[PDB]
Amino acid sequence: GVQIQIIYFNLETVQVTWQASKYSRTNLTFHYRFNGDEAYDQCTNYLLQEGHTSGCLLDAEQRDDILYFSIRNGTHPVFTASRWMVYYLKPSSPKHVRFSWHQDAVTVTCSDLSYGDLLYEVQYRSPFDTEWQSKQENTCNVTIEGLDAEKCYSFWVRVKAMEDVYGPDTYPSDWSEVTCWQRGEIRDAC
Template sequence: MRAAPGPWAAAATAVFLLGDFFFFFFAAGDTATGEALPIHIINFNFETVQVTWNASGPTGTNFTFHYRFRGDNCSQCPSYLLQQGLPVGCVLKAKGDLMMDFSIGNGTHTVLSRSEWISSFLKPSSPRDLQFHWREEATTVTCPDLPYRGLRYEVQHKSVFDQEWQSTEEDTCNVTIRALDADRCYSFRARVTTKESSYGPHTYPSDWSEVAHRQRGEPRASCQKTPFSSKFVLVYGTVAALIVVLLPLSVWKLHRVKKLLVPRVPDPKVTFPGLFESHQGNFQEWIKDTQNIAVLNKTGEDREHESLLEGPLVVQRPAAKAEAPAASTTGPSHPQAAHKEAAGDPDALPCPPAPGKDRISLGGFTFVVNDNAYVTL
């Protein structure tokens, strides 16, 4: 039998393996092939780590993945992600917030080697067991906090009348949402995000939790749009009542203001009867037909004055001028004229009016007078 190796042999083996590890991770470097190999790292809630490379298309190369967490030995990927039969990623179990050293090789040389804190690529798990505590116009959403810090818990909600989700965030999973309508049905969802000050800019938000539907604190299978809520009917009913009351008042006020500023123009149909009915608004034609027509209401004085006109009319002229015509017209040489005068013919005059004299007609009688004559009725 072969004797067991001594202590020096074990020490030599450890030195050999350690030198090989450092050569594997740091001697080759990222430029072994002179080509950049994009990688994508996701730390799923410090439970598993997923590293993918060139996942957008087939690489055509059978890459291998080696890794280790600080303080552990180097290991090959326990579970590869395949695409068209070739490895394009690796899924491995995480061991807390530790730094991970890894390398990707093509069998002959190392293509890439790197060291990263897996917390820089954290993707928290989704919130679970959401609880809703309703008050009058608010609800508080609670859930178990994740076992690490530096997180933000975001709860979104919307009703059937909202177009977009509305967000509310807190440092713990105890988020209160206010200004809710108790009569409406709301949908809720939650997720966890990381603080950049704690984990850096390359982290990922968690997936959204399952959407929960609540109305007045009671679970609903879904939220469907209802015609109107009671508050909606109250508000719009009040507005409609105010419009019904204020509109006539406004019209009345407007009419008074218009009447004050713009005086009313009288209708000519009342003032000028027949102007539009008979003459189509032609005032010249209307005035020709109506200028000699006047309807007067006779008062007591008018009737008395009219009765006086029925008595004899006396025409007085100056004595010197009135006697001569009288003598010449009643003499024997003019019996026809005397007969006409005695018969009372109003149209019979001894002769045409002389120049400078005027003819007037009163009560069916025609008289010739000069400037000095006057008539007494």
């Protein structure tokens, strides 16, 4: 009956949201902890939808732990689960994106995050390309050689967590603003 979603926004905030039409027009409570030997604390930051509780926000303070939680119809637990929080990591969108051109090459840099094992990916294309081409690195300094100064290229960047460290169920960041470039100068459309 209870459908649940978890997001760990940029290693700052955990958001757990739930849906259950049975317990609609009713405020279910959310209780959590970060260890299996401590008492549960109650949610101090509730999200609502259609006037009733639909989620919880926890400030996790960059901590890498197993979140243990339960949703209750008062005292009666309706849903119980436990998960490593970083499995639902969504890194923040690339900030301060800069491009430096040299003849038929470009180096795209941006502000690196405070946590490691991430992939900073740059996607690009010209009007002659049918799909986006991609290059990625461990830091936000990706160099793409062999392009054409004479062509217009659309570009955008994002941050992904590495599957070997964070597992397969993470979310890529949102892509940064799209930028268009011909002959080492910025443009409007492409």
